[PDB]
Every structure is written in C-alpha cells, then in structure tokens.
Amino acid sequence: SYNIIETSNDNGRPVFMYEFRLLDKYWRYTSADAKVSALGSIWEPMGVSDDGIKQTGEAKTDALNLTLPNSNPVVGLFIGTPPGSPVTLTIRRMHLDDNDPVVCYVGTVDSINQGENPTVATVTCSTLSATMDRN
Amino acid sequence: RWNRQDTLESFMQLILDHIGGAMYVSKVTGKLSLRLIRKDYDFDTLPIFDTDSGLLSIQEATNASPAN
C-alpha cells in the first residue's frame, strides 16, 4: 500500500531510514526523530540527512553526500584507517502505518572527510555504474 | 576488438552506443543492470502529466528554433 500513500496529494508520512552494512555488521538508522521499528529491526533516530539520490549517469556529480554525525561508529570505522572491505549503504522509504520500505539506494561508502561541521561528517556514496575507471 | 586496452567505462560506452542502451543500477536490488532505448511503449497506458496530476513546472519552456 506504499505507492498509494506516496502518490497522494494531501496524505503522507516522513521516514528515510539508512542501513550501514559490512559483512552483516549492521547499523539501522532513521533520519526522523522517533524510534522507528520496521523490517524486524529498530531504526534509531540519528542526525543523518540525505542530500538527494541523484541519478545522472555521470560520475562525481551523483556522489551521494550524507551528513553523518561523527560520534557514530559508522564514521568511527574511518578514523585514521578506513575498512579494508567496502561498506554498503541501503536507504529505505516507508511511511508510518506502512510496512514495505521500498529500497531506494544501494550505494557504497567510498570516502569520508570531516570538516567545518564537526557534528556531522560528509560521506560520499556512488554506485556501481560510476566506478568503472579501471585500467 | 579491444586491442591496446583502454578504460573499461570507455569500452562499455562504445558498446552501449552501438546498441543504443543505458547501463544502470536497479533502484531496489542495487544490482548492475542494462536498459535499451527502443519503441517499447504502447502510447495508451502511459500516465498523463499536467498541473492537476503531479506536474509542478516546466523548467524548459522556450523553443530554440530547432528546425535546422
């Protein structure tokens, strides 16, 4: 019943949940302000915020830039020495009273750099289409 | 042929241009996927977009004399 609520003009509910995955080592996040629980897991309300899931077919421009609080272990994995194995990010888009969070993005964590906003770092996540610069 | 090998994305660009298709990632799974640009539409089932059905604004409203 997701699409009916999503396409409504005067009906809707805000949720954007984030799954940070590393060989099944999981972090289930929620951009909303509540303790969202769906898909058999609790998606904690954390200060994550998307900048737009762009799909242009052009590398660099489509780099999903996430504002991720530094205190999270997700950023902690990248302090000094980032993981030797890629970390995958999955975003889901359910409403409330709904239970099918249609997945919307399956990009991976490519690079992270802290900076002027110490309360959240910038996380760049492209997709498989744009990682084809190999020799 | 792929002699004097070059960047892989360039070769895929060449092949896609030959077939006239789009390599893309499925929104749901995340798997790499391929699309072709063809006449695969029936001009009947297509959704109709106007301001009363979802259209917000036409950001490209000019015509650049595209006759030549």
Add this chain to the structure above:
Amino acid sequence: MWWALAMLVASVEVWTADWQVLGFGNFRTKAVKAKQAKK
C-alpha cells in the same frame, strides 16, 4: 544513440578531433570478440 542521450546536456553535432587509440590496428581478424592481449 546513447551519445545522443549523452549530449542531452547540450545548448541546443559537428565535430573535429583526433582519436585516443582503440582496438582497431589490425594484425588478427576477429569475426567475434575474443578480446586481446596488449604486449
């Protein structure tokens, strides 16, 4: 035609350029792509 969609960013197709080497220079006919070495 994916070039035509690639030029979707244009300001509207004539071109004048030399080439970055590709797999054309021939020393072995290939009725099908078996790829090739590079030496």
Add this chain to the structure above:
Amino acid sequence: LRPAREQFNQAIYDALNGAYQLYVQDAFGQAAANQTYYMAKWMKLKAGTYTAVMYVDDSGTLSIDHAVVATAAIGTNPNSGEFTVAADGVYRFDCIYSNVPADTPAYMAYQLIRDGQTVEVSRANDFIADIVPIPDKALGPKPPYSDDVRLTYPVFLPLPNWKDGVTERIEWQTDVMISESGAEQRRPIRLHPRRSFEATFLRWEENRTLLDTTIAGVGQSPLLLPLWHDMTATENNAPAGSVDIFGQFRVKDFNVGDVVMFNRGTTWDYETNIIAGLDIDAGHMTLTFGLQSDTPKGTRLYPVRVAQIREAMNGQQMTDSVSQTQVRFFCTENYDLTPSWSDFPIYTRTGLHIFVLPEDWGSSNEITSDRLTYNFDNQSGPVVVVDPGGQNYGTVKKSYTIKGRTADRQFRQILFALRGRTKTFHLPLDTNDFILSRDINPADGALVVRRCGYTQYIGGTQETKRDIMVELYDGTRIPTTIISSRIVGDEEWLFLSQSIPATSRNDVRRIGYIPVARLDVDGIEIKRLTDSAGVSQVSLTFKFFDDRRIATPLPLS
C-alpha cells in the same frame, strides 16, 4: 565541619589511575598528635568487588556504611584490595585518617578499581570535612540511583518572570510544493514536532548568581528544564521516603516515565524523580525512587523536559546586582500527544472538519488575495500577466485566546490533528455575508440573498467562495455548498447541493464562508501569560485555496 582539600601528585598520581592527595587541614604539613580527621560522601555502587589500593599516613582507613574495609601501612604498598559490598546501591564513602604525635604532613589517597575498572578514584570535592565523624543527615540527602541517564543532567532552578509572559513554540516541518497553476502537494517532515520554550528571567541577590553560574556551566549541554508553565502541587501529605503522591495532573504535561521535579522551598532544596506510572483520573503517581528527603502537602510539582539551549545568551543588565535576560530552550524528546477532531462538524460533502473555534476579536485580522504568477517584466513597454489556474486563494490571520487547562488540551489535540502545513480543514472566517433578503424555503432548494455581486462579480466558479456556513441563530452549524445561481432584481438566488431546514430569513447570525483552508506558518507561537490554567493566546494564519491534484497512483510500481 568544612570542605575537603586535595592535591596533584605526579609519581603517585600516575601510579594509581591518577589519584590525588586527600586531607582536611588547611595546609599539608599540619597534622596533630594522634588526631583523627573525618569525611564522608555518597558513592554509586552495584554489588561488585571494588578492589582498591589505598595509602595513608599512620594506618588511615577506608570504610563503607560504617564498615571498615582496609587500612594503609606507612609505606605506599598495595595495602588491600577487594572488599565486596555484595549489594547494589549508593553507600557512604566515609574514610578516615590520622597521624601520630608528630605534626608531619597528613595524606590520604585511594585506588577504587572495581574488578579492575576505575571508579570514584579521587577528586571527591563532594566530601564534607570535620574533625569528628558525622551522621548521614549531616552528609546530605542520598542521591537517587539514577539508573536512567536522564536524571544526571543539571537542573535549571532559576524561575521565570511571569509579568512579561512566557513564550513557547511547537515546531513541525511540513514542506508544501505548489505548481504553477496552484496545485498543491503536502509532506509532513517531522513525525513529532520539536519543542522550544522561552521566558524572561529577572533575578538578583544570589538568584542572579545562581542563574549565571548554572547557565555558564550548561552552555549547550542537555539540562532538566522544569515546565513552570505546567506548574502544579500535591493533594496529599507525603512522609520521608514515600514512593507515591496524589495530586492534580488531569491535563498538564505529565506522562508515564516522565521526569518530575519537587521544590521544597528556598529554590535550593530540590529533587528530580522518575514516575514509573501514574493515574490520570484518580490523580496519583508512583515514584521510581522514594522521594529524596520529605514532601509535605502542597509541594510544588513541575513536569520536566530534557531540553537544550541551542542559542547564545545575551548579556543584559540593570544594576551591579540586578539583571534580566531572555533564555530559550529546546526539548530533546518528542512531544507525543494524540490528535483528535473533538466535536467539530465533519462536512458530509467534503470529508473535512469545520474550524468552529470561537476565535476572538483582537485588534484586526489580515487580508490577502493572490494568484502567484507573472510575466517577463520587460525593460520597457507592456506586460501580460497570465492567470495559471483561474482560481482564487488567499491568507487570513485571526487570533485565538485559549482559557483553561482542558481548553489547552483541546487546542493541542486539534493542532495535532493538523500538522504545520499538513491537512485541510474548513475555516469559518466569521464574515457576515449574503444577508438573506428572502426567507429560506427548502422547496426551491435555493437561497435568496441581497444583491452583493456574487453571481456577477465573483460567479460561482470559485471553490474558495462556494463553501458557506449558515450559523442558525440557535448556534446550529449548517454547512452547505454553492452549485449554481440565478440573479434577478435586487436579490440573488443561490442553488445549493443539499437541503436546509425551513426557517425565516430572520433566523440566522451570519452566512460566513468556510473555504478549504490550510494553516500557513510551520511553527506556532503560543504566548503563555500564565500557567495552562489561563491565558494561552495564539495567532494562527490560515491559507484558503482549493486542493486540485488528483491521485491516480503511478501503476506498476
């Protein structure tokens, strides 16, 4: 009796998880003959082992609950280790030291490491130092076990200045996308609105000092904010150590598991406790922890919120001792409240709720009408503005003054039924219109009104001018919709889609419009001139329009 003293070592310090010297005498080298020196404080403990090395001058001793746990040989040896309390709770760390006839330096230090984990190692400024042992009630009230981390935050005791009003804002986030033609989209972004509070503080003579010290210490960290606007008091008398109280909590912001504060007078003897549960009718709550010291009848009760000061504070002053300033706070927890459209008519022909609120007659309301669209504004010459949708919309702001605690709950339930710019609802703007020249005859199914240019100047093809409320003189609300009209003589005929009870022309108050309306601003400013019991006026703004988008969901998702 006096505060304790401490010192910074380097070798010994680094030796045992960074411990300080501990002593009560003013300077280090001033012991006395076979003298004893006493001190005590509350330490939080589970039932663990609490292995601890401790070194003292001349067989000084550690102790818990008056039970000696070890004593120090004159050397800095690992004199002793484990001493298991064996019970979870807070206990009195009441170590004592001494020195033999000489007046050599008097020193203590200890190395509490539970199971090898450092705790309460040193720097116990909570001590109170005296040359004789003291009882618990001289030590001070035993603090709550605070299993919840919430109670650890500092409490903002300084009170507000009521004679200037208290400002609170409940903020949603609700994005609205409006097309070129006025077709609108709706998206509530915050499930539960984020809450902020403001008040003017005017303090002096050791209250200004309290406010200054506390606010400088907090700065930007979480703090326990007592909801003075939701003040209340006990209904029974509670003795020391009691675990439940009766009181008046019908409608004010009290919830299961809420942080509740007790004020025992003088503003310095306070308490913060957690209510595991409460009764909303048989006014009563059970305290997670036996109240701190005592709570006689009439103790002021404040519901508390885990807030944060997310802005800088202005330095404003009146005299060298008096000061005033406006401090804002932001609740960190969601403001959870059940929405409801209590008693308001549900128009059958639209499925929306009439906004029957008895809004007041403040100085004046605000008036607008727009179409939102324009042409290329030529550097010179003519311009041709294009109407995108040929439909009228506008905004009207009109004040409302709540009165009472239950009225406050009703308005919160309403304001949660809508959410910022979320939902539609019919708005009676209380504008007398359509003076009924003729009587209301249901047989013809059409109202006859004084000629005011409806059909001619406005016409019936405007949704924002089709919905009307015939507030019959008895107070009955008769919503109806305009569908067609005939214009003749000095009167105008208005056909309606539904019947109306047969009544004389002189049987009505007004025919005010009730168009489709949507609250304009995202965050609502409510001026609490007093606690919830009284003045809580608000200045809503309603944007009236027509909802146009038709949803035929995109197929084959």
